[PDB]
PDB file of C-alpha atoms in Angstrom:
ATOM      1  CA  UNK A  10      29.618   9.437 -34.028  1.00 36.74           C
ATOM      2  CA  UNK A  11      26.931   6.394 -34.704  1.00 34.86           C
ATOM      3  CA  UNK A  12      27.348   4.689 -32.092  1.00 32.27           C
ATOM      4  CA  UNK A  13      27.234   4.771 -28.207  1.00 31.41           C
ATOM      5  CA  UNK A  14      29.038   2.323 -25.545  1.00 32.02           C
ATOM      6  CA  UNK A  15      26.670   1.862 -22.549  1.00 32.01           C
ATOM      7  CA  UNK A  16      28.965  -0.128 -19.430  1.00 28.25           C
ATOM      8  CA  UNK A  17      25.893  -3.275 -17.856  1.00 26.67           C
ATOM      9  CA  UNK A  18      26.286  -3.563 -14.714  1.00 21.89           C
ATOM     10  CA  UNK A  19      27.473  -6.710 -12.951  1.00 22.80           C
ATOM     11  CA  UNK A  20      24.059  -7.421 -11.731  1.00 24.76           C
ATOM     12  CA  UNK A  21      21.689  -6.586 -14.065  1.00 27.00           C
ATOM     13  CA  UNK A  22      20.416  -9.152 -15.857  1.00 26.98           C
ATOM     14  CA  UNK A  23      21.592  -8.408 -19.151  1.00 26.62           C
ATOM     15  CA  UNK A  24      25.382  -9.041 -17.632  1.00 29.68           C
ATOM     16  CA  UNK A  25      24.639 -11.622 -16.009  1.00 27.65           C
ATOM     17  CA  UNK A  26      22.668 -13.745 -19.661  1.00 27.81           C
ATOM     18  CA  UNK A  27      25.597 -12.167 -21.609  1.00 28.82           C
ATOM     19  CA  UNK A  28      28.123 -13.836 -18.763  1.00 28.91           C
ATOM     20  CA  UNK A  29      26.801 -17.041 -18.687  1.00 27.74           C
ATOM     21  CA  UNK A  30      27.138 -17.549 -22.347  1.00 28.93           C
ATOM     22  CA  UNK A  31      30.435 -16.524 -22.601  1.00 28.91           C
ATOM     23  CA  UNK A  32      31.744 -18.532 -19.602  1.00 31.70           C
ATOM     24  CA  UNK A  33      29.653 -21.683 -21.223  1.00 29.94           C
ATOM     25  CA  UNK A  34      33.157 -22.421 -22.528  1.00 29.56           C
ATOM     26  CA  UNK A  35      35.444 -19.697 -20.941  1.00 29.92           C
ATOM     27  CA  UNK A  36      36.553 -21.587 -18.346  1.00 29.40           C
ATOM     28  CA  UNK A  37      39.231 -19.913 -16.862  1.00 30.77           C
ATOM     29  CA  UNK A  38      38.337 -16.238 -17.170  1.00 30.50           C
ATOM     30  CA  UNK A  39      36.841 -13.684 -15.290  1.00 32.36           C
ATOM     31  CA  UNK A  40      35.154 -10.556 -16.757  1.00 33.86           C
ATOM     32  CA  UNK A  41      36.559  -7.147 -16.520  1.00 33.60           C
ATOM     33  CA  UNK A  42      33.189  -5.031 -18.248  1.00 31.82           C
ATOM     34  CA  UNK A  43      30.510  -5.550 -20.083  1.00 31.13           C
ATOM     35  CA  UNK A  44      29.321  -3.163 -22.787  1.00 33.87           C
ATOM     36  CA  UNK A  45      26.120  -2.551 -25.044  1.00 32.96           C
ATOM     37  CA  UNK A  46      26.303  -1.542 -28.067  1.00 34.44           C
ATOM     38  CA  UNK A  47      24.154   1.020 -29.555  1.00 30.65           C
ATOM     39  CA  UNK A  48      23.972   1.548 -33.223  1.00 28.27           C
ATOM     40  CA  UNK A  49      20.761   2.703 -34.808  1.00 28.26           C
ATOM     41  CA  UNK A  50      22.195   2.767 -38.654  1.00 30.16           C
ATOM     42  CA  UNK A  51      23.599  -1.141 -37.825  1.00 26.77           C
ATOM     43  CA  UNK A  52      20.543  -1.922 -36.015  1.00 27.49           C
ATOM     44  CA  UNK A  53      17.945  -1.118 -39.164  1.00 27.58           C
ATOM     45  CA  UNK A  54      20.246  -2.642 -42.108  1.00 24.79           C
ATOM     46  CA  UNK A  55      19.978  -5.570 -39.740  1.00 25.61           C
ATOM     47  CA  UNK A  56      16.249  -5.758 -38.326  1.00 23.34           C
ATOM     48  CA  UNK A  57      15.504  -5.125 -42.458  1.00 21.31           C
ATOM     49  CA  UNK A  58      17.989  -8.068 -43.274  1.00 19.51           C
ATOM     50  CA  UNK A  59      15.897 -10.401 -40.481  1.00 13.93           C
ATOM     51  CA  UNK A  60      12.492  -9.567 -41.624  1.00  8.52           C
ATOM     52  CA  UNK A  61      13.678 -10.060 -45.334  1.00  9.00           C
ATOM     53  CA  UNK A  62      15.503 -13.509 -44.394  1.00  9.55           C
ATOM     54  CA  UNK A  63      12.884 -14.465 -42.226  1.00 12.30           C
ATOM     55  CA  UNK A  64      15.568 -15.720 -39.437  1.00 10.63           C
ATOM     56  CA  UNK A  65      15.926 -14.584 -36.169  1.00  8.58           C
ATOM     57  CA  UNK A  66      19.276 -13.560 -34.722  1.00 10.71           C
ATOM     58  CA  UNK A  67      22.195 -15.714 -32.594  1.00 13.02           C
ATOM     59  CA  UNK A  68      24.034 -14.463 -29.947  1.00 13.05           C
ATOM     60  CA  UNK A  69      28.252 -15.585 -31.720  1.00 13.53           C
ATOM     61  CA  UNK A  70      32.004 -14.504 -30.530  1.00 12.21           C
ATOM     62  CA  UNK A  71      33.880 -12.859 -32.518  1.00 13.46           C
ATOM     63  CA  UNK A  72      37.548 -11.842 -30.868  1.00 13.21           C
ATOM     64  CA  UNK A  73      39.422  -9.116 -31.701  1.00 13.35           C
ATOM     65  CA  UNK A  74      42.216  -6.146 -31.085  1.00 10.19           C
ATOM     66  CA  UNK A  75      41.182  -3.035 -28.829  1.00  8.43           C
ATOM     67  CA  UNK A  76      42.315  -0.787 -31.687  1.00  7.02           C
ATOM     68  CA  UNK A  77      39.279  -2.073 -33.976  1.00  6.62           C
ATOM     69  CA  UNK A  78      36.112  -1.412 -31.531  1.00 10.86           C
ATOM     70  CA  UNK A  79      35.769   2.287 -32.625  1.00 10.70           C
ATOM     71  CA  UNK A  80      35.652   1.091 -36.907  1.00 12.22           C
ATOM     72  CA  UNK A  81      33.634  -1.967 -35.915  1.00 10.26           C
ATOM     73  CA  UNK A  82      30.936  -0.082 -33.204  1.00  8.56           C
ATOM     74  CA  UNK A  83      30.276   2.685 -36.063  1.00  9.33           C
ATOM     75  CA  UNK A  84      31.052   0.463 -39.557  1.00  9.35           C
ATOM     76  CA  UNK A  85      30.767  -2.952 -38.784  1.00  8.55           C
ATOM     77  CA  UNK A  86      32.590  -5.930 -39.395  1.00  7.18           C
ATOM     78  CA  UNK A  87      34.603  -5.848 -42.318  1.00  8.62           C
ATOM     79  CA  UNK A  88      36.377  -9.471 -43.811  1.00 13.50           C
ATOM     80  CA  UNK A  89      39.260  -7.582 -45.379  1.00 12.27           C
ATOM     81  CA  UNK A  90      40.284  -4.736 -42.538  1.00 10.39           C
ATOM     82  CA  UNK A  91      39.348  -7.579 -39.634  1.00 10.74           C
ATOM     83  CA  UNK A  92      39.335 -11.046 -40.484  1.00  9.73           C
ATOM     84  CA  UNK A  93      41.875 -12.495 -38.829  1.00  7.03           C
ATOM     85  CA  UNK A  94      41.195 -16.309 -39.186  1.00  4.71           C
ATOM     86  CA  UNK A  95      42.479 -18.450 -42.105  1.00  8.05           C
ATOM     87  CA  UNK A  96      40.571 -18.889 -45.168  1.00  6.36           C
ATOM     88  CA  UNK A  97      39.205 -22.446 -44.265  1.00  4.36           C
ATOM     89  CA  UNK A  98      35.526 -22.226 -45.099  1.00  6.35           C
ATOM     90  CA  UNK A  99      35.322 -19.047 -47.569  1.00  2.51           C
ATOM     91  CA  UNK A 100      36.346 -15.290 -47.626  1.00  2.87           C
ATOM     92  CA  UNK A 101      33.774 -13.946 -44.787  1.00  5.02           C
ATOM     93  CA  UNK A 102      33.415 -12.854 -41.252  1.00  6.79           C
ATOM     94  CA  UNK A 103      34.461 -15.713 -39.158  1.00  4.87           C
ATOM     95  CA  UNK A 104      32.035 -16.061 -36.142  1.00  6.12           C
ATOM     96  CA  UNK A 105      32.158 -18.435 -33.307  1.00  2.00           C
ATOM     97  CA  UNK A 106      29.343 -20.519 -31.254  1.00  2.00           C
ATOM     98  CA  UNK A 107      32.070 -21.184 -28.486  1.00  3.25           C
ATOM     99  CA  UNK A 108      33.623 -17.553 -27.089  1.00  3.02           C
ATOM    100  CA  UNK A 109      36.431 -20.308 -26.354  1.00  3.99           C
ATOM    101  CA  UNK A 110      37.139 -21.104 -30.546  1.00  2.94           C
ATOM    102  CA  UNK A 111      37.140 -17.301 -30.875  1.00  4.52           C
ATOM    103  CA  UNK A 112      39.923 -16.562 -28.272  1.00  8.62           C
ATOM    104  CA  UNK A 113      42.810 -19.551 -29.267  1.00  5.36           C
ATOM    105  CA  UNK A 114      42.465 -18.379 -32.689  1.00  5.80           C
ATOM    106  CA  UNK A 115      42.893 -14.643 -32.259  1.00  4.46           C
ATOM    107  CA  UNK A 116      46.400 -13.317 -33.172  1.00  2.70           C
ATOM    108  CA  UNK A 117      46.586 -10.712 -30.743  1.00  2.00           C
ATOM    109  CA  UNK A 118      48.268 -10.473 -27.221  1.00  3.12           C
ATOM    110  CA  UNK A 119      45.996 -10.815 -24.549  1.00  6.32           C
ATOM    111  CA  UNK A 120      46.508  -7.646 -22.882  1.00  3.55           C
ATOM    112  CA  UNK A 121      44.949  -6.295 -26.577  1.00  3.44           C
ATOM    113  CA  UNK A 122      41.987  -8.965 -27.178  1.00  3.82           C
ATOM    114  CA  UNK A 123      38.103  -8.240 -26.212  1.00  4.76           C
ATOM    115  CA  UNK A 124      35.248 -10.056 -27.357  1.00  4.96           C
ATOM    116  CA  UNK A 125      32.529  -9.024 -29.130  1.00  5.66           C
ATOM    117  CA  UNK A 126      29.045 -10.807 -29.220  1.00  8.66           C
ATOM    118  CA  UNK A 127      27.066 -10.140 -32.377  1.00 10.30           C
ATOM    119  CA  UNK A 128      23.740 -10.805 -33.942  1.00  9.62           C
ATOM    120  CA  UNK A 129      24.074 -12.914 -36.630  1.00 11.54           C
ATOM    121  CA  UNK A 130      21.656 -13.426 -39.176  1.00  7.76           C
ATOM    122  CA  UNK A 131      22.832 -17.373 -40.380  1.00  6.15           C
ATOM    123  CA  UNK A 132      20.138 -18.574 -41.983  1.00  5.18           C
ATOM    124  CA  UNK A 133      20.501 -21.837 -44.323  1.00  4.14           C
ATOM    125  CA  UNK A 134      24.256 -22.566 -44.110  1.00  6.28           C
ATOM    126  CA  UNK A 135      26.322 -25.321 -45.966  1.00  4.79           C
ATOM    127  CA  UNK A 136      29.719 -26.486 -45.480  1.00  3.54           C
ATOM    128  CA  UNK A 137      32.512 -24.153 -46.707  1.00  4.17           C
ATOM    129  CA  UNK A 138      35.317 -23.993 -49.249  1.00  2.00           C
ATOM    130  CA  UNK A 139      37.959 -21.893 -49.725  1.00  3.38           C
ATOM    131  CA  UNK A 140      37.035 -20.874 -53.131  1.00  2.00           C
ATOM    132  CA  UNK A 141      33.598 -19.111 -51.661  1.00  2.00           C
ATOM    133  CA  UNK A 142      33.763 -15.166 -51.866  1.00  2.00           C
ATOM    134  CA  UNK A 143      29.860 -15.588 -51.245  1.00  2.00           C
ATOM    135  CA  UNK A 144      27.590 -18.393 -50.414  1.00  2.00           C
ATOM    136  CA  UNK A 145      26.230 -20.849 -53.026  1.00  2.00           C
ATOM    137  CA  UNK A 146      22.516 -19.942 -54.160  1.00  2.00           C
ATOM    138  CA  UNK A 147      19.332 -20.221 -51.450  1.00  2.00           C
ATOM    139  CA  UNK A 148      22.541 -20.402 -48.461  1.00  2.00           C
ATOM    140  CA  UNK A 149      23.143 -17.260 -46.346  1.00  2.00           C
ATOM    141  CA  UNK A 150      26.287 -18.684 -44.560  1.00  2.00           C
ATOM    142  CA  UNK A 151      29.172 -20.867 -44.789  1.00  2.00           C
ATOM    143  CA  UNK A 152      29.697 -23.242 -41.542  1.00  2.00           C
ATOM    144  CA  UNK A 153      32.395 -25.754 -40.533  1.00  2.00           C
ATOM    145  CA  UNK A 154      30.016 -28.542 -40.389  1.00  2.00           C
ATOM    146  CA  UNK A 155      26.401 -29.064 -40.792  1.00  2.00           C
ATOM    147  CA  UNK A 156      25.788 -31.404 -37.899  1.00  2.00           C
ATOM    148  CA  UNK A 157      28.063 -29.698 -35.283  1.00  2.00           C
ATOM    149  CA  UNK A 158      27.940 -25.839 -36.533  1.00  2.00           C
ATOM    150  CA  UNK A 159      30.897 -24.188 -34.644  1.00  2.00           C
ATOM    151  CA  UNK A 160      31.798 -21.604 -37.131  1.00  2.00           C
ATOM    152  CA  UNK A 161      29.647 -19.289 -39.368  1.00  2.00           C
ATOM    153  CA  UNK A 162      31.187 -17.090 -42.418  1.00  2.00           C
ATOM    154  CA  UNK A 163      29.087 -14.348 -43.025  1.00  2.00           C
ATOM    155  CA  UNK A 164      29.587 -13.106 -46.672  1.00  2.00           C
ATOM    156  CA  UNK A 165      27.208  -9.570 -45.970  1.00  2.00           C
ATOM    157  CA  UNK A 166      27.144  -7.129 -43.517  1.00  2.00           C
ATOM    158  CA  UNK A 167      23.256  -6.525 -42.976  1.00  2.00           C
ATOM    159  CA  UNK A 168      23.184 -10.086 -41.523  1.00  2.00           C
ATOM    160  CA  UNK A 169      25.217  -8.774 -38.555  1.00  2.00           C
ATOM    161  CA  UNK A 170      24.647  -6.374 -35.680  1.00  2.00           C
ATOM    162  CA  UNK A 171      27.562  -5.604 -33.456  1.00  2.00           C
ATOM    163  CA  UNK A 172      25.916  -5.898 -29.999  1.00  2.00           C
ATOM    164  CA  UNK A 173      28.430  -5.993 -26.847  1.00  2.00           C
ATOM    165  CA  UNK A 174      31.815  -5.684 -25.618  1.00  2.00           C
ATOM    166  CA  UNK A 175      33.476  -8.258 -23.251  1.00  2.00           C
ATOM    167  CA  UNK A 176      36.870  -7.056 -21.250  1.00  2.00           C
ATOM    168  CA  UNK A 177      38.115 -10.125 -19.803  1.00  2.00           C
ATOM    169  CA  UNK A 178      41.191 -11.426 -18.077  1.00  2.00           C
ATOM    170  CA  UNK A 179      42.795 -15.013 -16.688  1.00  2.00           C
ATOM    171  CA  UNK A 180      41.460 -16.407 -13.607  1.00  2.00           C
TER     172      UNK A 180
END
């Protein structure tokens, strides 16, 4: 196994940063758990990829089934087993500023969505196309729009690090 699942606690502060962000736009939602993952294999591709890029990472959403945590905890995201969203902005890993955008585009019933929060390693980004299997030259992403970016397409795996698990439910 690579990986570990460590429950936060409510109250610690790590919940409570990780809460705040998510509610930013999740409204109407309460929180069922929190989890941290660990991965050290994930963790070095990516701290390699940062110091390389010379970006820090961004907290984004990315929503998805219950039945992909294990293969996404130990592999990472993957476009083709995982990506769910259409092919707007290029053939990546669609990731989401708002945990909101995220949820009303996952295809999945409710009662089989969580949310992860990744690193993300975005770097310079440019607008999208559909025709993109990878960025353009001296990009690192793909993005919706440059003035407003809402959604980041991440072409490469070593610019992401799976970091929690968010259970939530209606309120």
């Amino acid at each position: 196994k690579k990986y570990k699942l460590s429950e936060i606690h409510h109250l610690h502060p790590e919940y409570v940063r990780v809460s705040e962000h998510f509610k930013a736009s999740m409204k109407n939602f309460k929180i069922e758990k929190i989890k941290k993952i660990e991965n050290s294999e994930l963790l070095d591709k990516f701290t390699w990829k940062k110091s390389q890029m010379k970006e820090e990472g961004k907290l984004l959403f990315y929503a998805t089934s219950r039945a992909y945590v294990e293969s996404i905890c130990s592999n990472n995201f993957d476009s083709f087993l995982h990506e769910t969203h259409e092919n707007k902005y290029g053939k990546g890993i669609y990731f989401a500023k708002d945990a909101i955008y995220s949820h009303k585009n996952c295809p999945y019933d409710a009662k089989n969505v969580v949310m992860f929060v990744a690193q993300v390693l975005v770097g310079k980004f440019i607008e999208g196309n559909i025709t993109y299997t990878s960025p353009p030259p001296q990009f690192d992403s793909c993005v919706d729009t440059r003035s407003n970016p809402s959604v980041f397409v991440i072409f490469q795996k070593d610019q992401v690090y799976p970091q929690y698990v968010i259970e939530y439910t209606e309120d």
